[PDB]
Amino acid sequence: PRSLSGRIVGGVWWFFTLIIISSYTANLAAFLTVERMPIESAEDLAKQTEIAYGTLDSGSTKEFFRRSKIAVYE
Amino acid sequence: DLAAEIAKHCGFKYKLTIVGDGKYGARDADTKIWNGMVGELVYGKADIAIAPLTITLVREEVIDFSKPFMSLGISIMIKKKSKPGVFSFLDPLAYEIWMCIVFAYIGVSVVLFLVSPRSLSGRIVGGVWWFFTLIIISSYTANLAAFLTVERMVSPIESAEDLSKQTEIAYGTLDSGSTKEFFRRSKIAVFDKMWTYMRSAEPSVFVRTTAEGVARVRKSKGKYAYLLESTMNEYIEQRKPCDTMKVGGNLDSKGYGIATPKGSSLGTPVNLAVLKLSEQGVLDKLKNKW
Amino acid sequence: LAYEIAKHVGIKYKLSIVGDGKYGARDPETKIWNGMVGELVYGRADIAVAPLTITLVREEVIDFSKPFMSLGISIMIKKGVFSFLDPLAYEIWMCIVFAYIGVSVVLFLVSPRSLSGRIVGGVWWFFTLIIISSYTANLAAFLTVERMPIESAEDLAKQTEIAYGTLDSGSTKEFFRRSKIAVYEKMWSYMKSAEPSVFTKTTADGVARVRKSKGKFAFLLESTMNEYIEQRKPCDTMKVGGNLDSKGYGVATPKGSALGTPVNLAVLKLSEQGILDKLKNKWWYDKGECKTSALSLSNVAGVFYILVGGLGLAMMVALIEF
Amino acid sequence: CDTMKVGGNLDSKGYGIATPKGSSLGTPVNLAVLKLSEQGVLDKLKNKWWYDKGECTSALSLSNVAGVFYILVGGLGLAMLVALIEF
Amino acid sequence: IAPLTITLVREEVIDFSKPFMSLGISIMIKKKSKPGVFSFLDPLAY
Amino acid sequence: AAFLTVERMPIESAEDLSKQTEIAYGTLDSGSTKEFFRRSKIAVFDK
Amino acid sequence: APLTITLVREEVIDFSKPFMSLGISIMIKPGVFSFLDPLAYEI
Amino acid sequence: CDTMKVGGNLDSKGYGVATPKGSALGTPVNLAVLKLSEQGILDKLKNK
């Protein structure tokens, strides 16, 4: 019933979730309006393995990667 | 570092000397004399130039250049990923509104307090108060969305094309040099649009030095973008105060090369050394290091 | 400024207000100069210290100091519970009320898991869910796009809902007529053809037009005057954008004056010492009287009054019951 | 009334009354145009022939919301049917 | 006395008064109501 | 909310015209309007 | 022709300065991760 | 029309005109290339 202690807890928690679900809704709407766009950089490629990537089996492109001392290309 | 590497690979001892006039190398149209590092090679005051000297036709006609040890092109430098402030939560719903919603809050808990199932009196109070809060939370949600929708709309320069399209953000290039010329001579629509704007912009968007163009970006409060070499742009981006950013792809392609007087006995070996260092991956190591 | 110049040049002086109250132009008929320029060219005054613009036509007949104040053409702009009844149409508020009593009457015929009236409460809930969702979504639209709000000459040039113009003669109109800059040429093309006329006879007319035309007029004028009016009551206008061009006010002396050199050097000294900046700040600001990212209380307020009204109605229904 | 004018004018031109070169009518006719313009007569004339003799808002619609009203009354009717059978 | 535009080529051979009417190139398009309960079934896919 | 925002975001200007090809557009076959476009150095008009 | 300036070739023929610059580049052609984005994983 | 380039270039190299060792064309060809580049002709040609 009216247990003031845990009562304000339920109220504050409700106000808390209210703000969050409102934020989620608002933000999702922005997303559905602009909707700007899954690989955009060598950095992106390097950090993952689901999208495989490669080169000609011989020639300068393969050699570039083999020789590079730059962290991302290594 | 590059000098130590080529000296080692070519087998020679050397002395590093800073160019007396602090210039790169251009030929005065009137006196017909060469200045800078090119002048020092042409006139016999130095036997090799190891520096960020671009391989150009006019220079190649008077000195020898190895193959490029580093690539570059015209790029864009703009004044710029952190922005908390709990005050972005108090904005959507105005402080004045948070107040009244609290006054009416106790304004209802006091009306109900005077009442004590279907008690029609306080019944419509709960209903009207519900309809009241419904509108408010709906307003908060809707309003919060516009601030996030526009936050995404902001795509505020990301390319030459972006630049070419407006005039809120002024933009220029070194007052004399290859970047200014590139735009002056270009037959590409975007670049020609950027040139007719630049040449007539007032106050002048052209800078006397590269350092001025960087300082202008940093001190113009987001109203100036500078067109400079990609190598320089990406280097400043890694320097404190960390307030600049390189945007868009390179507009052209040039290269730095090590130069020697024509017919120099050092030319063959020095060129071979650059190919080797590149292939060993050393030039890339050096760029990442610095 | 007169006191400072006199001190630095070392002379005694008498301030005399020009009789005709004019700056100085050649009469069309007689070609005789009026105003302060007239007082100088016809031997009545030794020097003019006033907001007198450095212009070719004047520099041909008198000498100007370097500018003591810079200025340019600038844009002046002016800074309903019915915005709550718009999102959800009056017709919709009605039907939602008709269906409202349309459900309270259906339930009234019914009298836990009473399947009959049970699905009624569920369907009615799904109904109100859609409506409140529509209201929320729609309300987000106006506050997102918000098409009519002017921050630049570029903005003005791209639209026609907010009209804009200048004095019907004089240098501001001429700037636009002569400009080869794309944005100002576009502005000139619009202004010269606009109907009703966007040109005014006086600054007062232009400023009044900004104030009383429901945000549908912007006025183009000198930055100094724009800035001054921005700092006077009723504090309802403001300057937007930077200056569109550059010109200067100068001190004027008659040709052959022995004061010419000393006056010029005095002006440059006062400028470089920061005195002129301070003086402008004094008279404009010290003596003054005064995208989108904000949410207002206005609309929300209308919902507060209907709440208190409901509370009062209940406080009335309560009393009668007892 | 099926056409519409959109966008601002792309350029600026003007119509003028013409006379042979050196005509004795030229001076007077030009002065007359300035006068008629200043008296506001040319604007009266354009409004008369374009608008007086002419032969031709913001927010949400009810259409979409209406579809949700019919599904409501349909639910009420379904309940009024389930009620009768129960009794 | 007609809707005759003041142009250079014509001005070189005849006299023109100041303009009695302004004009410019504009766009004419063939022309605001759209119900369809199918704008409600779109947001949330069938 | 997005369906109404975009709904506010089918020709309203020369720029609109210049950007597409669903709606064809032309001018008198001879005359000053045709020439204006032929001679123009403005990007929208040249397009 | 589009003949790349290389060490092995520069040893036996002479190349002009480049007439075209180029470099190594990346060619590419639902995701429930568009639901985890709005509200951050941290949130 | 189903592929695209992403990111900038990862390195830099060039295509050049090649002449046999000892060719009397070497110098003129090199200067011609630099002239066409600086005049904006090669950019225009690539765009074409």
Concatenating the DSSP letter of every residue in chain B gives: -HHHHHHHHHT--------TT-----B-TTT--B-HHHHHHHTTS-S-B-SS-B--HHHHTTEEE-S-SEEE-EEEEEE------GGGTTTTS-HHHHHHHHHHHHHHHTTTTTT----HHHHHHHHHHHHHHHHHHHHHHHHHHHHHHHHHH-----SHHHHHT-SSSEEE-BSSSHHHHHHHH--SHHHHHHHHHHHH-SS---BSSHHHHHHHHHHTTT-EEEEEEHHHHHHHTTSTT--EEEES--SS-EEE--EEETT-TTHHHHHHHHHHHHHTTHHHHHHHH-
Q: What are phi and psi of C195, to 5 degrees?
A: -135, 130
- What φ, ψ does residue B112 adopt, rounded to 5°? -65, -35
Angle at E38 between CA E33 and CA E44, to 5 degrees: 130
C-alpha Rg value of chain C to the nearest Å: 32
Residue of E nearest to C195 (CA): E22
Looking at residue C81, the DSSP 8-state letter turns out to be G
Method of determination?
cryo-EM
Token pair, residue C192, equals 């010269």
Resolution in Å, one decimal, please. 10.3
Exposure string over B162-174, b if 16+ CB within 10 A, otherwise e: bbbeebebbbbbb
What does DSSP assign to residue C233?
A: T
Asked if the C-beta of C313 comes within 8 angstroms of chain D's C-beta atoms, the answer is no
| Nearest-by-Cβ selection for C115 from D60, D73, D82 | D82
Sign of CA dihedral B71, B75, B77, B80: negative
Among candidates A31, A42, A64 on the partner chain, residue whose Cβ is nearest the Cβ of G38: A31
A14 close to B (CB below 8 A):
no
Question: What letter does residue D18 receive in the DSSP assignment?
Answer: E
What's the rounded Cα separation, in Å, for the pair F1 and C33? 65
Task: Indicate which of F13, F34, F39 best probes the interface with D, i.e. most D CBs within 10 Å of its own CB.
Answer: F13
- Please, do chains F and C touch (3+ CB pairs < 8 Å)? yes
Phi, psi angle pair for F24, to nearest 5°? -75, 160
Q: How many CB atoms lie within 10 A of CB B277?
A: 19
How many angstroms separate the CA atoms of C124 and D79, rounded? 12
C119 and D72 in contact (C-beta within 8 Å)?
Answer: no
C193 in reach of chain E (CB within 8 A): yes
Gap between the terminal Cα atoms of chain D = 61
G2 annotated among ligand-binding-site residues: yes
Label residue C200 exposed, middle or buried (CB < 10 Å: 0-12, 13-18, 19+).
Answer: buried
Chain-chain contact of H12 with G26 (C-beta, under 8 angstroms): no
Q: Is F24 touching C (CB cutoff 8 A)?
A: no
Report the residue numbers after which chain C has a gap, meaning the C atom sits over 2.5 angstroms from the next written residue's N, or none: 79, 111, 148, 290
Note whether H touches B: 3 CB pairs or more under 8 A: yes
E10 is in an annotated binding site: yes
Contact predicate E28/D4, CB 8 Å: yes
> Does H48 touch chain G if contact means CB atoms closer than 8 Å?
no
Q: What does the DSSP 8-state code read for residue H14?
A: E
- Dist CA G3 CA G7 (whole Å): 12
Distance CA C243, CA C249 (A): 15
Q: Do chains G and H touch (3 or more CB pairs under 8 A)?
A: yes
Residues of B in contact with C180 (CB under 8 A): 200
Are the C-beta atoms of B198 and B206 separated by less than 8 Å? yes
- Write a three-state SS string for B129-197: HHHHHHHHHHHHHHHHHHHHHHHHHCCCCCCHHHHHCCCCCEEECECCCHHHHHHHHCCCHHHHHHHHH
Strand positions, DSSP E, C119-263 = 163-165, 217-222, 237-240, 247-249, 252-254
Pick B55's closest partner by Cβ from G17, G20, G23.
Answer: G17
